Amino acid sequence: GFGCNGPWNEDDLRCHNHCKSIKGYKGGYCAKGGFVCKCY
């Protein structure tokens, strides 16, 4: 989700923008299955 639609269309930036909008995290990337924007 969040820009990232999976391995065919991953989006480090959209995930990043989502995760950096959440206090505590700084980044986000397609982790689980290549779909889920995991926030770090």
Alpha-carbon distance 40 to 32, whole Å? Answer: 13
Q: List the CATH number of the domain containing 33.
A: 3.30.30.10
- How far lies 20's CA from each of 8, 31, in Å? 24, 16
Count: domains in the chain: 1
Q: How far apart are CA 4 and CA 24, in angstroms?
A: 21
Radius of gyration over alpha carbons of the chain, in Å?
9
Domain range for 31 is: 11-40
DSSP the chain: -TT--BTTB--HHHHHHHHTTSTT---EEE-GGGTSEEE-
The answer as to whether 2 is a domain residue is no
Technique that determined the structure: NMR
Q: Which residue has tokens 């639609």?
A: 5
Report the sign of the C-alpha dihedral through residues 34, 2, 28, 40, in that order. Answer: negative
